[PDB]
Nucleic acid binder design. Structure first.
Ligand SMILES: [Zn+2]
Length: 61
DNA sequence: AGCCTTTGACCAGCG
DNA sequence: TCGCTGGTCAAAGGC
């Protein structure tokens, strides 16, 4: 729910590390842009980490 | 209508 | 080999 200035579309969600956390997978909405992030929530909905892969081919919108 | 989640299937690296 | 764990796909539904 927090923002970092980019547009992400969610392409999956999975339970990990023995149903302890749940991980959400997003990729950047800008065309041809291969950047993906994932973010990983605690059982209480609190966000633990955020993982960024790659870089955008466009600047911040 | 055109974006967006959600959800289970699919699949691939690895133990 | 085999089954587990995680990453993605595609089909549906919501706003
Ligand atoms: Zn991008």
């Amino acid at each position: 729910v927090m923002e970092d200035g980019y547009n992400w579309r969610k392409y999956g969600q999975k339970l990990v590390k023995g149903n302890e956390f749940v991980r959400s997978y997003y990729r950047c909405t800008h065309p041809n842009c291969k950047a993906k992030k994932q973010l990983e929530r605690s059982a209480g909905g609190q966000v633990v980490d955020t993982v960024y892969f790659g870089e955008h081919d466009h600047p911040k919108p």
